[PDB]
């Protein structure tokens, strides 16, 4: 009781939810568009000053503690990878931070990075569209192909949000909350936190065997980011060859994901359907 | 009793004293030290903890709070009783603690836990009494304004008045007589600065470490010195080297502003040269003065708005929030550290570059004002060299601003740079 | 981004729709019309508290006639909307219910319209679009509607903007003098500004109204009230601390890839009374999938056409509540088996639905506000009928004497032919969208 | 000592502007029309006895000239309560109600037969004022005598105290009115010759855009010279209040005037007070610097090159936050409110105006916003061309051959057009990379 009632590490957990999961909703949307214009639009994505300023400004409107515990120290690739390289940190009480480990901070940062990459691909698909792809017969075929790709990508993005939340965040987050609710002793809390981190990483396909489907999905996401960038640059950077390459990437990703998750089968059925 | 106990026997332990995150923290520490800590320093406290003569039951945390409280009693008797105020032992709290201490020393076991609990109660009572006394009698808002106007040399109307009147001893050679006459000149300037309340101005005066007074320079501004009066016990609270650092920052800012004012005189001489067409050496002087004026305008605007106005408003509001004299001092020192980082006086090469920029502005000033009319052979050479110096100082300043932004945060610097970068031809 | 937008309301029907939408959106924000706004997810943009704390509505009853302006001034909605929010045009006689005088008034007061827009856009921090209601056949929404669309396309081409314009009446005979001519004049600028916009498809709009309340001898007021409730129902993604479509720009752009067909099928729920619940019923994934499966209770004015077999290429049941991804997956499997969302040849219906916590001041009386976003041959038929109306107006010189008196309609038959051709090209791209080649 | 200034009422319209400016400067120190300034109203850090010089009877004795060349004008100025603050020793009262007759020949005659008088008046004003950098002449060159009086009074001020060449409110009135006395060529010539010759600065605000902005923002239906004069007086009071009340660095505008002259003639810079209408925080003001809703100078603003604000400043009266100033820097950099000159990097600055305690600034960021619009000197080129063309097309040029501005010939008009064209060429060079060769 003496160690727990004062330090309010539940506030640290809430900040992890709000930043490592981008739960500051309206401000989160504003920061998502700003981050798209920063990293995706070739702004100061790796600049510590610019990234920190953007993060603090978007995270200071109503709940500044998100900007306090999370500052966007940017630094330094695939379309998903070029946006990476930043650094960050957090604040927590001590000697509560004595039991607290930087490994859990790194795991939360990895979850935040996965969410940020998903949101960056989502914003790239948001800016891109059939209209963007043809912005800069063959015209009808390009419009139809872009429409099919956009419909597939939109369904995939909505499913990613909801289902990934359920698998890695909703179910795993609820389990972590329940475990922390049970955890009140230093050793028990450390064990509960480690178990919660492992459960959250379980839906992250961190296992070596689970990394094959993760790599297929990552290749699909990188190809999607490149294709969305080419569509945003229109037909000038969009070629019938490039469109065929994107369609082949989508189809091969679907087939390989179906095979991998069948060899887990729910993702296999989804990929075969896609 | 007064923080007062004869340590001559030293029977107690009371000493009568006299990697991105890590790299960023270390660089910030070095630059902040070399900028803010360059001239500010306090005097060693008259009390300390001679823990070599401490008992085993000297509880480390209770002893830290006890050093704070004993030095608080000493501070009461030496600042709150420095000259006019009165810092007793604990006043009536001393009698209450006397009864409690009779009970405690009656108790055989030296239980530092409950003893430290009562001691911390007394310490919090002392802190509350000190906070009330500070809120009542401290009233250092006027002292802060005086520090800005003189210690920071930031009273703009009185500064212009002094330039018109009190520069007769700053621009004059440094002599003790000129130093003392600067006091009268500054009083006259304040009297003509829309100010007629020379009470602290009567407290204000001038006594420079002049060429004849530093040892017994060639400019009274070079070997300069003012004479203002502080109020007790805030005189003790004002670390003498802290006021020295205020004066040093004011002197650096005044060197920059004197280069700026001389350049203003030079460009106003070119505008009074508007009696015929400007020449080509005169065009060199006009271009030098215009580049210097633009750079000085951007730098002065950024510094005043943020390095000065932002820091000043932040310090004022934070001191208004910090109801504890220590917390208000913390707000003032936060503003001081912010101003030191804005000064960028950390590196000796940085100070040399700032002096070079100020001297280039002053050289453009001399070239344009002296050649307000035609630029003679000397006038043309001075105008061309001044234009080159202003351009080189601007280029080196853009490079230094980029480097400083890369090292640490620079908001006012970035705003000023982008303001100049509305075209960025000279910035780039 | 976390953004804000402004709406405009041209023509009598457009102005009424805009005022009703402002009132209903204030209700979704827990805000009274007079500006008594309710007190993570910032939602004060719509009721934009000005410097005087006036919760300025993000809408303008931009009616050329002074009737709507006077009504808003007498109403409390002006006590919330700032003066910049009420952009009353100077065509105090309306705009003649035809795109001739509509375009004249729109171009003339475009200075005032664009100035009020710029006054609202001075605080365009993260704004990305705008909305509009416009009688697409009435001058203020047909000619002045086309003028507003052109002026907006000129003003903010960087980011796409929307409009929900009162389309010309085709179910009711477009027998006005410039009825279809003005419809084509509006549609020219509508297709010019076509990225993702709403057309007041009135045939199936009246059908949905009959399925909802079936007000005997319904007027435009009931449709305006329903659209207002839908507008207040379109503030749920970010209503709770937004984890679902707070930055919904991508979701909006994913409805229909081809921006040329800005109109996309979408039907908000409930298309029933405010007590459309069953004996032991709630927002259940399968139950909502079955209850909201009706495709004829939306505002999809499939015109005198069924030319294309385009079915739902996208499907997004955007409701409000609390939907777990496990129940979402159960509903997805049951809906894939049901095939309740028909498929366009360009691709099967996108598997999607939204379900997020309602805002603290956005309560409703329906289990699910299922806004079934799709795109089907109903829109193809609507495009075909709009093209037929524009072409019939051009080839018949709809009120040829008034077209000659008209500025645009007398400027050249090229404009009317091009408007009819734009509508026909939308219909043709819909028919080919039912084929492999979309456009 | 603090900084003082003089303000001449060059012209009959200049006299009206001077009376209005006396009223507005009394308000800027909270002084009544007779000069009764409340203690709080005069509680600013400004030297109130500089412009509204402290008389014996607490009257805001304007260390400033209110011209009186016409009987009606002199009587109106005297009956104007604001002139009760203004000193009565600055009125060289004349009862010629005809005036200079819309010809700058008689304006130059008034300013030259009183050029010795003008120099003596400047000396007397310097005796009353503490340290006047110059006379802020309400040089409404479009008045009956305004332009010729401007020229001759500029010569007389050079005779009196040319030590610091300064600017003047050379507010050209709205020339949109019907022009029949085409002696305006000679008049604008007389004004511009002395202006560009002594160009330290000049408030050359061609009032076509002033009337346009009044109708656009102030919604001035049937705008007259009275609205322009009142706005000019209010702006002059604001500019005195902000500078006089202690600005920590460069509380005087003399530095800006000095920086405005890239050369002896290239001293034209269009400033702008934001905003005008019938708050704009620091960021909103930076976004609104491009806003011409308060544009006063009719400018042939040919900004094809960087013929726009190479130097940009913003002193916004009211509560201005340095954080809002940084938001302003970002918003201005992204929005590109004003252009540059290609000399070097376009300087830009912004701060909170240390205003006098006479009046408040409800608009947290609203006030002067200086700029160096080189294309405004394309309008100075337009005025020089008007002088050279109205004098060449016999439009009161053969008539001006009987007028002192062009009585012998339009040689004065030619030299004035040459000076204005030199300023315009400096502006166009500022537009190009030739800004060094302005």
- Judging from the principal axes of the Cα atoms, what is the shape of chain A? globular
SS content category of chain C: alpha/beta
The proportion of residues in beta strands of chain A is: under 5%
Largest sheet of chain A: none
Number of beta strands of chain C: 10
Largest sheet of chain C: 4 strands, mixed
Alpha carbon gyration radius of chain C? 21 Å
Query: Would you list the SSEs of chain A in sequence order as H and E?
Result: HHHHHHHHHHHHHH
Specify the overall morphology of chain C.
globular
Tell me which oligomeric state these chains represent: part of a larger assembly
Q: Helical segment tally of chain A?
A: 14
Name the beta content range of chain C: 5-15%
Organism (chain B): Sus scrofa
Subcellular location (chain B): Cytoplasm, Cytoskeleton, Microtubule organizing center, Centrosome
Domain Gamma tubulin complex component C-terminal (chain B): 140-426
Main location (chain B): cytoplasm
Question: Would you kindly provide a written description of the structure presented here, covering whatever features stand out?
Answer:
Chain D: This is Tubulin gamma chain. Chain D: Pfam families: Tubulin, Tubulin_C. Chain D: Belongs to the tubulin family. Chain D: InterPro entries: Gamma_tubulin, Tub_FtsZ_C, Tubulin, Tubulin/FtsZ-like_C, Tubulin/FtsZ_2-layer-sand-dom, Tubulin/FtsZ_GTPase_sf, Tubulin_C, Tubulin_CS. Chain D: Residues 249-385 form the Tubulin/FtsZ 2-layer sandwich domain. This is part of a larger assembly, with one copy of chain A (274 residues), one copy of chain B (428 residues) and two copies of chain C. Chain A is mainly alpha-helical and 274 residues long. Chain A is built from 14 helices and no strands. The longest helix of chain A is centred in the middle third of the chain and has 45 residues, at 138-182. Chain A starts with a helix and ends with a helix. Chain B has 16 helices and two strands. Chain B has helices at residues 20-36, 60-78, 92-106, 112-138, 141-151, 156-164, 167-170, 176-191, 200-203, 234-237, 240-272, 280-321, 325-343, 348-370, 377-407, 411-420, and strands spanning 14-15, 48-49. A two-stranded antiparallel ribbon of chain B has the order 1-2. The N and C termini of chain B lie far apart (66 Å). Chain C has 16 helices and ten strands. In chain C, helix 4 (99-108) crosses helix 6, helix 4 crosses helix 7 (179-192) and helix 6 (139-155) packs parallel to helix 7 (179-192). The radius of gyration of chain C is 21 Å and the shape is globular. Classes of the chains: A mainly alpha (274), B mainly alpha (428), C alpha/beta (439). At the B-D interface, helix 6, helix 11, helix 12, helix 15 and helix 16 of B face helix 9, strand 6, helix 11, strand 8 and strand 9 of D.
């Amino acid at each position: 009781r003496t160690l727990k009632k004062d330090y309010r590490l539940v506030e640290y957990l809430q900040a992890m939810r709000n930043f490592f999961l981008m739960e500051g909703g309206d401000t989160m949307y504003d920061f998502y568009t700003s981050i798209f214009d920063k990293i995706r639009e070739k702004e100061t994505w790796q600049n510590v000053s610019f990234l920190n300023v953007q993060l603090q400004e978007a995270v200071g409107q109503r709940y500044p503690e998100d900007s306090s515990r999370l500052s966007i120290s940017f630094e330094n690739k695939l379309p998903v990878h070029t946006l990476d390289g930043l650094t960050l940190s957090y604040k927590v009480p001590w000697p509560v931070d004595i039991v607290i480990s930087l490994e859990c901070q790194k795991i939360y940062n990895q979850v935040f990075l996965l969410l940020l990459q998903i949101k960056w691909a989502k914003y790239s698909l948001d800016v891109l569209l059939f209209g963007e792809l043809a912005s800069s017969e063959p015209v009808r075929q390009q419009i139809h192909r872009m429409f099919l790709l956009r419909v597939k990508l939109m369904h995939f993005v909505n499913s990613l949000h909801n289902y990934i939340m359920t698998r890695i965040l909703h179910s795993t987050g609820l389990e972590f909350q329940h475990q922390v609710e049970e955890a009140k002793d230093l050793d028990q809390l450390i064990k509960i936190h480690y178990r919660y981190l492992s459960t959250i990483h379980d839906r992250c396909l961190l296992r070596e065997k689970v990394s094959f489907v993760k790599e297929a999905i990552m290749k699909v996401l990188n190809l999607a980011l490149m294709f969305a960038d080419g569509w945003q640059a229109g037909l000038g950077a969009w070629q019938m060859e490039s469109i065929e390459k994107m369609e082949s990437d989508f189809k091969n990703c679907h087939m390989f994901l179906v095979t991998i998750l069948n060899k887990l089968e729910s993702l296999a059925l989804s990929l075969m359907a896609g | 009793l007064h923080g007062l106990l004869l340590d001559q026997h030293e029977e107690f332990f009371i000493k009568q004293g006299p990697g991105l995150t890590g790299k960023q923290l270390r660089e910030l520490q070095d630059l902040r030290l070399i900028e803010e800590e360059n001239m500010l320093a306090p005097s060693l406290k008259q009390f300390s903890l001679r823990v070599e003569i401490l008992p085993s039951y000297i509880p480390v945390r209770v002893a830290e709070k006890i050093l704070f409280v004993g030095e608080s009693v000493q501070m009461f008797e030496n600042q709150n009783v420095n000259l006019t105020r009165k810092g007793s032992i604990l006043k009536d709290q001393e009698d209450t603690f006397a009864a409690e201490l009779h009970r405690l020393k009656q108790q055989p076991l030296f239980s530092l836990v409950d003893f430290e609990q009562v001691v911390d109660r007394i310490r919090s009572t002392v802190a509350e009494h000190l906070w009330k006394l500070m809120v009542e009698e401290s009233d250092l808002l006027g002292q802060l304004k005086i520090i800005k106007d003189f210690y920071l040399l930031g009273r703009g109307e009185l500064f212009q008045a002094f330039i018109d009147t009190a520069q007769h001893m700053l621009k004059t050679p440094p002599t003790a007589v000129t130093e003392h006459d600067v006091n009268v000149a500054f009083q006259q300037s304040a009297h003509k600065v829309l100010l007629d309340d020379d009470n602290l101005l009567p407290l204000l005066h001038l006594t420079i470490e002049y060429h004849g007074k530093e040892h017994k320079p060639a400019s009274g501004w070079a070997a300069l010195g003012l004479s203002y009066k502080v109020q007790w016990p805030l005189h003790i609270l004002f670390t003498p080297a802290v006021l020295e650092k205020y004066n040093v920052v004011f002197k650096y800012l005044l060197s920059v502003r004197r280069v700026q004012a001389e350049l203003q005189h030079c460009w106003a001489l070119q505008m009074q040269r508007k009696h015929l067409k400007s020449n080509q050496t005169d065009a060199v002087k006009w271009r030098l003065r215009n580049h210097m004026a633009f750079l000085v305008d951007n730098l002065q605007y950024y510094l005043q708005v943020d390095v000065l106005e932002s820091q000043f408003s932040q310090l004022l509001h934070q001191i208004n929030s910090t109801r504890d004299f220590e917390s208000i001092r913390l707000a003032h020192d936060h503003f001081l550290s912010n101003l030191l980082a804005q000064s960028f006086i950390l590196l000796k090469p940085v100070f040399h570059c700032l002096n070079e920029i100020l001297d280039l502005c002053h050289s453009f000033c001399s070239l344009v004002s002296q050649n307000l009319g035609p630029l003679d052979e000397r006038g043309a050479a001075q105008l061309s060299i001044l234009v080159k110096g202003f351009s080189r100082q601007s280029s080196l300043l853009f490079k230094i601003l980029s480097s400083v932004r890369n090292h640490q945060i620079n908001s006012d610097l970035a705003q000023l740079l982008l303001r100049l970068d509305y075209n960025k031809y000279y910035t780039q | 981004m976390p953004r804000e937008i402004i709406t405009l309301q041209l023509g009598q029907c457009g102005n009424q729709i805009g005022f009703e939408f402002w009132k209903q959106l204030c209700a979704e924000h827990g805000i009274s019309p007079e500006g008594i706004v309710e007190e993570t997810d910032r939602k004060d943009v719509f009721f934009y508290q000005a410097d005087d704390e006036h919760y300025i509505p993000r809408a303008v009853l931009l009616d050329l006639e002074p009737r709507v302006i006077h009504s808003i001034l007498n109403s409390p909605y002006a006590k919330l909307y700032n003066p910049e929010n009420i952009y009353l045009s100077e065509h105090g006689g309306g705009a003649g219910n035809n795109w001739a005088s509509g375009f004249s008034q729109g171009e003339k007061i475009h200075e005032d319209i664009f100035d009020i827009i710029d006054r609202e856009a001075d605080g365009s921090d993260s704004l990305e679009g705008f909305v509009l209601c416009h009688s697409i056949a009435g001058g203020t929404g047909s000619g002045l509607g086309s003028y507003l669309l052109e002026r907006l396309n000129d003003r903010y081409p960087k980011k796409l903007v929307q409009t929900y314009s009162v389309f010309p009446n085709q179910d009711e005979m477009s027998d006005v003098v410039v009825q279809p001519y003005n419809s084509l004049l509006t549609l020219k600028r509508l297709t010019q500004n076509a990225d993702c916009v709403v057309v007041l498809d009135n045939t199936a709009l009246n059908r949905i109204a009959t399925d909802r309340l079936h007000i005997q001898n319904p007027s435009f007021s009931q449709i305006n009230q329903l659209v207002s409730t839908i507008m207040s129902a379109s503030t749920t993604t970010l209503r709770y601390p937004g984890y679902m479509n707070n930055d919904l720009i991508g979701l909006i752009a994913s409805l229909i890839p081809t921006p040329r067909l800005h109109f996309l099928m979408t039907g908000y729920t409930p298309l029933t009374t405010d007590q459309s619940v069953a004996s032991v019923r709630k927002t259940t994934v399968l139950d909502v999938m079955r209850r909201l499966l009706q495709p004829k209770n939306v505002m999809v004015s499939t015109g005198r056409d069924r030319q294309t077999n385009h079915c739902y290429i996208a499907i997004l049941n955007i409701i409000q509540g609390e939907v777990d991804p496990t129940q979402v997956h159960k509903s997805l499997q049951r809906i894939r088996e049901r095939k309740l969302a028909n498929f366009i040849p360009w691709g099967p219906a996108s598997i999607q639905v939204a379900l997020s916590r309602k805002s603290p001041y956005l309560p409703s009386a329906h289990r699910v506000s299922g806004l079934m976003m799709a795109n089907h041959t109903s829109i193809s038929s609507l495009f075909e009928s709009s093209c037929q109306q524009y072409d019939k107006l051009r080839k018949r010189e709809a009120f040829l004497e008034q077209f000659r008196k008209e500025d645009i309609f007398k400027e050249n038959f090229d404009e009317l032919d091009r408007s009819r051709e734009v509508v026909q090209e939308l219909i043709d791209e819909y028919h080919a969208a039912t084929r492999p080649d979309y456009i």
